[PDB]
Amino acid sequence: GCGKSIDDLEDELYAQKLKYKAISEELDHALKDMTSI
């Protein structure tokens, strides 16, 4: 695992989690906007 493979995993982990934060923050704000439909 560690040595080479994990680096690509951490690379991706960091990226995916940032995208996860972005998408969740985006959609959270999307419903947060009105919050009373």
């Binding site: 959609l27 959270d28 419903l31 919050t35 009373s36 439909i37």
Partner: protein, 33 residues
């Protein structure tokens, strides 16, 4: 699912349904008087 709008839409139409039910029976009463 997107819990926010999913549940809020339910709450939405539950409210609007009692409203449309009221206004429908109400406008009927408007025809009564």
């Amino acid at each position: 699912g997107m819990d926010a709008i999913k549940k809020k839409m339910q709450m939405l139409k539950l409210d609007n349904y009692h409203l449309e039910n009221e206004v429908a029976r109400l406008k009927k009463l408007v025809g009564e008087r």
